[PDB]
Amino acid sequence: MISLIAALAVDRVIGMENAMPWNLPADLAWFKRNTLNKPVIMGRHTWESIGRPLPGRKNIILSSQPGTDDRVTWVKSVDEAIAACGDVPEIMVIGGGRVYEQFLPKAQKLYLTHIDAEVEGDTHFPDYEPDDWESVFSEFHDADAQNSHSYCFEILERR
Ligand SMILES: NC(=O)c1ccc[n+]([C@@H]2O[C@H](COP(=O)([O-])OP(=O)(O)OC[C@H]3O[C@@H](n4cnc5c(N)ncnc54)[C@H](OP(=O)(O)O)[C@@H]3O)[C@@H](O)[C@H]2O)c1
Ligand SMILES: Nc1nc(=O)c2nc(CNc3ccc(C(=O)N[C@@H](CCC(=O)O)C(=O)O)cc3)cnc2[nH]1
Ligand SMILES: [Mn+2]
Ligand SMILES: [Mn+2]
Ligand SMILES: [Mn+2]
Ligand SMILES: [Mn+2]
Ligand SMILES: [Mn+2]
C-alpha cells in the first residue's frame, strides 16, 4: 500500500522557498519513526531541500531528467517509482506538493501533522475530500521548550 506523510501548517501550507520555515523536533522524530526501514518517494525539489540521503531508507527520486547522484534511485514516472520499491508492505511518499497531488488518489493512508503555526507559503498540501477518510489515531501536544508550536499527529485511512 501507498501512504503519504506530511506536516501541514495553517491553510495546508507545507513549504516556502524550498524549505520548511518551522522547527519541530518532535515531528521530525515522528517522521523518522514512521519512515525508517521503508522506501521513501520524493520529488526532485524535496530531494534538494533535504540535501542528503535519508539513512536506513531506500530513497527514490522522481525527476524528468537523468540522476546526478548514485546514492539514491532515480525514476522518471509514478509507475516506475512504485515498481522500484518492490514488494514491500508500505511505500512512504514524502512530498512535495506536486508529488503529493499525484499519489493522493492511490494512497490508502495519510500520516498528517497539523501544526498550529501561521506561515506564508508557496506550496500546499492537496485539497483532500474529507468524506473519503477515517481518522484512526490522533494525538495532541502542547508547545514546550523544544517545540515552539502546538501540534497534532493524525493517521487517516481511506474508507
Ligand atoms: N511539510 C512537509 O511535510 C513537506 C514535505 C515535503 C516537501 N515539502 C516542501 O515542499 C516543497 C517542494 O515541493 P514542490 O511541489 O515544489 O516539488 P516536489 O513535488 O518535491 O518536486 C517536483 C519535481 O519532482 C519531479 N516530478 C514530480 N512528479 C514527476 C513525475 N510524474 N515524473 C517525473 N518527475 C516528476 C519534477 O522534477 P524535474 O523538474 O527534475 O522533472 C518536479 O519538478 C519545498 O518547500 C519543501 O520544503 C514539505
Ligand atoms: N511529518 C512530516 N514532517 C516533516 O518535517 C516532513 N518533511 C518532509 C520533507 N523534508 C525533510 C527534511 C528533513 C528530514 C530529516 O532530516 N529527517 C531526519 C531527522 C531525524 C530526527 O531528527 O529525529 C530523518 O532521519 O528522518 C526529513 C524530511 C516530508 N515529510 C514530512 N513529514
Ligand atoms: Mn487566511
Ligand atoms: Mn500511473
Ligand atoms: Mn510485485
Ligand atoms: Mn503557533
Ligand atoms: Mn487537487
Side-chain angles (χ1 to χ4, degrees):
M1 71 167 26
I2 292 167
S3 298
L4 278 48
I5 183 160
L8 282 55
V10 162
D11 285 343
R12 305 195 327 273
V13 169
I14 61 168
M16 180 56 173
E17 292 174 307
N18 219 40
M20 294 184 294
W22 57 82
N23 165 60
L24 285 178
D27 174 58
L28 287 179
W30 161 269
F31 174 87
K32 189 171 176 182
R33 186 176 319 114
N34 286 302
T35 58
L36 201 65
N37 299 319
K38 303 174 187 177
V40 296
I41 296 172
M42 74 194 87
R44 179 182 59 82
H45 294 155
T46 293
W47 161 246
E48 285 167 1
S49 181
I50 292 168
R52 42 163 257 285
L54 291 172
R57 282 147 286 190
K58 186 173 183 170
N59 289 232
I60 293 157
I61 321 297
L62 277 155
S63 176
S64 69
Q65 310 219 22
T68 56
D69 189 325
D70 274 348
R71 300 176 297 168
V72 299
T73 296
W74 299 83
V75 298
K76 298 191 192 290
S77 70
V78 164
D79 293 321
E80 191 186 358
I82 294 171
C85 296
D87 278 343
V88 295
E90 188 173 23
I91 296 162
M92 305 297 296
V93 176
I94 70 165
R98 286 155 66 194
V99 169
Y100 288 137
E101 196 200 15
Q102 287 168 93
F103 279 89
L104 182 64
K106 297 184 170 54
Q108 281 276 298
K109 195 169 179 179
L110 304 176
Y111 299 76
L112 300 184
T113 304
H114 305 282
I115 304 170
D116 291 321
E118 194 104 53
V119 290
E120 291 265 56
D122 56 21
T123 309
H124 294 79
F125 194 80
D127 192 26
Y128 58 103
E129 166 59 70
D131 290 357
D132 292 341
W133 298 92
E134 179 170 31
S135 172
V136 299
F137 175 83
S138 71
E139 182 182 278
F140 177 72
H141 295 272
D142 280 308
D144 61 26
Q146 296 177 50
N147 302 273
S148 66
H149 303 286
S150 54
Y151 51 101
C152 185
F153 298 131
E154 186 179 27
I155 301 165
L156 305 173
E157 296 187 335
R158 194 183 282 282
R159 286 188 160 120

